[PDB]
Ligand binder design. Sequence first.
Ligand SMILES: OC[C@H]1O[C@@H](O[C@@H]2[C@@H](O)[C@H](O[C@H]3[C@H](O)[C@@H](O)[C@H](O[C@H]4[C@H](O)[C@@H](O)[C@@H](O)O[C@@H]4CO)O[C@@H]3CO)O[C@H](CO)[C@H]2O)[C@H](O)[C@@H](O)[C@@H]1O
Length: 206
Amino acid sequence: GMADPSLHEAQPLKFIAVDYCPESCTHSPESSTITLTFDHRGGSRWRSTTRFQYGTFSSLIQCPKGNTSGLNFNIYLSSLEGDKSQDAIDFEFLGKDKRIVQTNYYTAGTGNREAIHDLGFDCSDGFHEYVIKWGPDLIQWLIDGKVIRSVRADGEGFPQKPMFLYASVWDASYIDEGRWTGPYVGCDAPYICLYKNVNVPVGTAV
Ligand SMILES: OC[C@H]1O[C@@H](O[C@@H]2[C@@H](O)[C@H](O[C@H]3[C@H](O)[C@@H](O)[C@H](O[C@H]4[C@H](O)[C@@H](O)[C@@H](O)O[C@@H]4CO)O[C@@H]3CO)O[C@H](CO)[C@H]2O)[C@H](O)[C@@H](O)[C@@H]1O
């Protein structure tokens, strides 16, 4: 009993696109780091250049410092951002409180499956690991190696369309009178959200 016998499959996300405002996204593939910045310019959004059909997705993430009230930073899967009938699976940080994270998923445009989780840490205090495990009848969310939520196919729809990996930072303060992410204060810009060692499924790109 010397070798670790534990079964251990993922590949680094090498190729990404930026959907708007590329000046507020940086990619350093040589250090496996992507950053997103929120400031006057209005944020940005990156994504994988390919869709995937199921698999495990992960990133180290360090959220922005300072007063992030109003902001939404995230990492998520979506069949197509902006599609009214999208399938999706979310990690969304709510800027009013950097010690929580919200999970959610969408089936043919329908969400309303929010859950709020206590992180046990400040998400801007160093890099932490966020994982989405997406299967045909089981979705799991992991944080620093621990499952924080599991949902199984319950007959009320399930994400099954091929999906892009996405990440953005945006001002969500207009949602629910600012009660969701807080009012936007925005006096600590640039708000820099960092993604490191983003990994995608080995063999499910479609
Ligand atoms: O131009 C006026 C106004 O524009 C602002 O920038 C907006 C920006 O707010 C918007 O953010 C998207 C974001 O890119 C996207 O990732 C996010 O996706 C959601 C998804 O819709 C949900 O279903 C769920 O899965 O969770 C995801 C992650 O939160 O949705 C937001 C909101 O639509 O993107 C648009 C471009 O498409 C962009 O114009 C800008 O900040 C302001 O300064 C400006 O006034």
